[PDB]
């Protein structure tokens, strides 16, 4: 009975799911366009944790002493002190993380943090560390602006639907909301400098690999 | 329950009482029809004290008339234990009977403290009983007894049987931001009457849920019906621990709910559609 | 609790609040203060000294907001009337229809107590282009659109619907369907052919917008 | 639609399967070989070798549910499989 009911439903090249009549069952397969084979459980950091712990893990301040970024974490850590521009960028990043926290707490009322998602970023960062033999005692050569702009560019490259109009662009931006949340929670400046003392080469490698990997993760048109 | 009443106990019991369906038949021991021409007294010493209790109250009322007085006594003896369990008093049942029998049945009450919970009733028939206790047909009293024991809803929601209040934990953000388990009191019933139970005061209408997704569709719409159907499928599949990806069950429910209504996978549902004849 | 007791006044007040919220969500202008009327204030304004509210005094008129009329230049004025008769005979429906016709109200909502006779129901489509909506006070006691399961429904303008169909290369039939009698459809007062945007908080993705077409 | 093609620029799994199958069938049918055959014998392996070099002339017509289509040449498509 089940096989006959859903027999003729297929993913088409416009990424929608339709039956033999062309009727739309859903406007993107699985509501995010990724195939099940490439999903796997991952943690959403921002959902859990106390406000103080969340701020400590994510907030970075170049001006005040409450959450100062230790200068030893960057090859220009001393210079960045002040620089209202970098502070504005980091404040925007923290506001985005707070918005993600609120949005996720809305989506998952019970606060569950482990949910399937396409690309496993923990493995990507572990691979970067093992490949580049990153030394945890050498102040990384990354810069706050580089990190922020790289993450934003990656988010811009999270292509599922490739239309040029505004309806398809809204759909595509919606389809990557949760993966963007995972990225922002995982690639926070503070985390990328303290927890994962990556270098610029490793950061570029991680971003490129994430791009490629979820691009390989998207469902194939013609899938029955 | 509502957020301001969930953490407590007795308010949950009050909601239980407001929802749970209960009739006279659940509290009555036996119903007896007795012969008693006397409208103000009785040949039965057992009911003499009860009659005297209301003799100074009812028979002393102005505009005394026998139109509601008959020689037949429909004596119901209730269960004290059952009434105590349901938090029912002679009051509630009496005015419910009055509501169903505004002026077609003169009803006498027994004192709650009395060991004999008695509802002494007489037939009503104006223009024939006005000044006499004429022998009304006993079948009239038997029909009245049927109506009392079947068609009288003392309290609760129709089609809602035993309501089982129980406690289990739900995660809510602590003021520090951490998710902590806050014990909550809820009710799990039998039979579905969403359309009424939603409106009962004291319940959080935004959280009420049922496993009969058809009623969810009827009351909340096709989108809530689809969500409830997915929840039911997920519960069925995860009852054994093993789980399937969200996409498969989401696709199944989406297919079942594309036509603005619940479609079955039978030959009456997807098979009677617009698809190809050979398909 | 008698009819005059709070057991019924509270239900009436909650239905009033639900009606105000429903009219506000349709795009008409209703101040947030009116939506949050306290029970005591409602009794003072409407409930009689005898405990019997004058339902005729709860009659209500709403007008499209600036944004709603800008997006829906066909919108008109709304009239809402809570009838007094427990049973809606054809005479009361005829009187209401005449009132709508003479006031030239584009849309009118008729909230009734118990039931409407089929003869009266036959008068609903009797005054085009004006449309008459009927609601049962019991249904309106709780605003079903506030339920956790129910997502947010948004009505699309004809231009928005045309653009959607053009971008997805769809026909009117190839969209998912929503019936006219759907409780949310009645709440939004959808007409046949009006497409509704539904925004859900998907598990796989943060949000997922789907659409349905009234049938 | 000659441009603004909204379909994926990556050759799909089924597209790869059918391209390799078609080229294997053609080579088995003694079709011309476009690559420097390095002593290979299996038509499928030759097809894979000349797909690696983007030396398969065939294109891929991608039908949309409304009947339209897009012509993608295997030289354009990115073989990320």
Short mmCIF file of C-alpha atoms in Angstrom, two decimals, chain A residues 3-166:
data_model
loop_
_atom_site.label_atom_id
_atom_site.label_comp_id
_atom_site.label_asym_id
_atom_site.label_seq_id
_atom_site.Cartn_x
_atom_site.Cartn_y
_atom_site.Cartn_z
CA UNK A 3 4.82 1.80 -2.10
CA UNK A 4 1.87 2.27 -4.45
CA UNK A 5 0.82 5.48 -2.69
CA UNK A 6 4.22 7.19 -3.04
CA UNK A 7 5.37 5.34 -6.15
CA UNK A 8 5.53 8.24 -8.61
CA UNK A 9 6.96 10.99 -6.38
CA UNK A 10 10.35 12.19 -7.62
CA UNK A 11 12.76 15.07 -7.06
CA UNK A 12 12.86 17.24 -10.18
CA UNK A 13 15.56 19.52 -11.53
CA UNK A 14 13.90 22.56 -9.93
CA UNK A 15 14.55 20.78 -6.59
CA UNK A 16 10.83 20.41 -5.86
CA UNK A 17 9.09 17.11 -5.14
CA UNK A 18 6.19 16.23 -7.43
CA UNK A 19 4.00 13.28 -8.39
CA UNK A 20 3.24 12.05 -11.91
CA UNK A 21 0.72 14.89 -12.37
CA UNK A 22 3.33 17.55 -11.65
CA UNK A 23 1.52 18.55 -8.47
CA UNK A 24 3.88 19.90 -5.83
CA UNK A 25 4.16 17.66 -2.79
CA UNK A 26 6.86 19.82 -1.21
CA UNK A 27 8.80 22.74 -2.65
CA UNK A 28 12.16 21.24 -1.63
CA UNK A 29 12.97 17.65 -0.76
CA UNK A 30 12.99 17.09 2.97
CA UNK A 31 12.40 20.84 3.47
CA UNK A 32 16.15 21.46 3.08
CA UNK A 33 17.02 19.67 -0.17
CA UNK A 34 19.64 17.32 1.31
CA UNK A 35 19.50 13.56 0.91
CA UNK A 36 19.36 11.34 3.96
CA UNK A 37 22.51 9.40 3.07
CA UNK A 38 24.73 12.42 3.78
CA UNK A 39 23.07 13.64 7.00
CA UNK A 40 24.49 12.71 10.38
CA UNK A 41 23.95 13.80 13.96
CA UNK A 42 25.65 17.01 15.06
CA UNK A 43 25.43 19.28 18.09
CA UNK A 44 24.02 22.82 18.09
CA UNK A 45 26.12 24.57 20.71
CA UNK A 46 24.09 27.77 21.08
CA UNK A 47 20.90 26.07 22.28
CA UNK A 48 22.26 24.86 25.61
CA UNK A 49 24.40 26.50 28.25
CA UNK A 50 23.81 29.39 30.60
CA UNK A 51 23.88 32.99 29.45
CA UNK A 52 27.21 33.56 31.20
CA UNK A 53 28.69 30.39 29.70
CA UNK A 54 27.32 31.27 26.26
CA UNK A 55 28.84 34.75 26.41
CA UNK A 56 32.17 33.41 27.68
CA UNK A 57 32.34 30.81 24.91
CA UNK A 58 31.31 33.24 22.16
CA UNK A 59 31.60 36.90 23.16
CA UNK A 60 34.86 38.66 22.29
CA UNK A 61 35.62 42.24 23.32
CA UNK A 62 38.66 44.28 22.28
CA UNK A 63 37.78 47.35 24.39
CA UNK A 64 36.77 46.29 27.91
CA UNK A 65 38.46 43.86 30.29
CA UNK A 66 35.42 41.61 30.83
CA UNK A 67 36.02 39.39 27.77
CA UNK A 68 39.37 40.54 26.41
CA UNK A 69 40.85 38.49 23.58
CA UNK A 70 44.26 37.37 24.82
CA UNK A 71 46.85 38.99 22.50
CA UNK A 72 48.79 35.70 22.41
CA UNK A 73 46.09 34.16 20.18
CA UNK A 74 46.97 36.30 17.14
CA UNK A 75 50.22 37.47 15.58
CA UNK A 76 48.67 40.96 15.75
CA UNK A 77 46.70 40.48 18.96
CA UNK A 78 48.25 43.51 20.65
CA UNK A 79 47.50 45.79 17.70
CA UNK A 80 43.80 44.94 17.46
CA UNK A 81 43.13 46.39 20.93
CA UNK A 82 40.76 49.28 20.35
CA UNK A 83 40.01 49.48 16.63
CA UNK A 84 36.32 50.28 16.89
CA UNK A 85 35.90 48.70 13.45
CA UNK A 86 36.88 45.24 14.69
CA UNK A 87 34.74 45.76 17.78
CA UNK A 88 31.76 46.58 15.56
CA UNK A 89 32.34 43.45 13.48
CA UNK A 90 32.58 41.30 16.60
CA UNK A 91 29.49 42.90 18.13
CA UNK A 92 27.57 42.15 14.94
CA UNK A 93 28.82 38.56 15.14
CA UNK A 94 27.70 38.25 18.76
CA UNK A 95 24.29 39.74 17.95
CA UNK A 96 23.91 37.19 15.16
CA UNK A 97 24.83 34.39 17.57
CA UNK A 98 22.27 35.67 20.08
CA UNK A 99 19.61 35.74 17.37
CA UNK A 100 20.54 32.16 16.44
CA UNK A 101 20.24 31.14 20.09
CA UNK A 102 16.76 32.62 20.37
CA UNK A 103 15.63 31.19 17.03
CA UNK A 104 16.87 27.68 17.84
CA UNK A 105 15.27 27.79 21.28
CA UNK A 106 12.05 28.65 19.46
CA UNK A 107 12.44 25.81 16.95
CA UNK A 108 13.39 23.12 19.49
CA UNK A 109 11.21 23.84 22.52
CA UNK A 110 12.77 21.01 24.53
CA UNK A 111 16.28 22.31 23.85
CA UNK A 112 17.62 19.15 22.22
CA UNK A 113 20.99 20.03 20.71
CA UNK A 114 21.94 16.92 18.70
CA UNK A 115 20.15 17.00 15.34
CA UNK A 116 21.06 15.45 11.97
CA UNK A 117 22.75 17.88 9.59
CA UNK A 118 24.56 17.40 6.28
CA UNK A 119 28.22 18.28 6.86
CA UNK A 120 30.13 17.08 9.94
CA UNK A 121 32.27 20.09 10.81
CA UNK A 122 33.97 18.48 13.81
CA UNK A 123 35.64 15.96 11.51
CA UNK A 124 36.61 18.75 9.11
CA UNK A 125 38.37 20.70 11.85
CA UNK A 126 40.05 17.56 13.20
CA UNK A 127 41.29 16.80 9.69
CA UNK A 128 42.59 20.35 9.30
CA UNK A 129 44.51 20.13 12.57
CA UNK A 130 45.98 16.72 11.74
CA UNK A 131 46.90 17.70 8.18
CA UNK A 132 48.55 21.02 8.98
CA UNK A 133 50.18 19.87 12.24
CA UNK A 134 48.91 23.07 13.80
CA UNK A 135 50.95 24.13 16.82
CA UNK A 136 48.79 25.27 19.73
CA UNK A 137 51.57 27.45 21.21
CA UNK A 138 52.22 29.63 18.14
CA UNK A 139 49.95 32.71 17.88
CA UNK A 140 47.88 32.16 14.76
CA UNK A 141 48.14 34.56 11.83
CA UNK A 142 44.37 34.91 11.41
CA UNK A 143 42.64 38.27 11.64
CA UNK A 144 39.16 39.00 12.97
CA UNK A 145 38.06 40.59 9.70
CA UNK A 146 39.38 37.62 7.73
CA UNK A 147 37.46 35.14 9.89
CA UNK A 148 34.20 37.09 9.75
CA UNK A 149 34.30 37.77 6.02
CA UNK A 150 35.30 34.19 5.24
CA UNK A 151 32.39 32.79 7.23
CA UNK A 152 29.98 35.24 5.59
CA UNK A 153 31.23 34.33 2.12
CA UNK A 154 30.81 30.64 2.89
CA UNK A 155 27.25 31.28 4.05
CA UNK A 156 26.69 33.08 0.75
CA UNK A 157 28.02 30.00 -1.09
CA UNK A 158 25.56 27.63 0.63
CA UNK A 159 23.72 27.10 -2.66
CA UNK A 160 20.79 24.68 -2.86
CA UNK A 161 18.45 26.51 -5.26
CA UNK A 162 20.10 28.50 -8.06
CA UNK A 163 17.30 30.76 -9.24
CA UNK A 164 17.98 34.44 -9.89
CA UNK A 165 14.61 35.86 -8.79
CA UNK A 166 13.47 36.71 -5.24
#
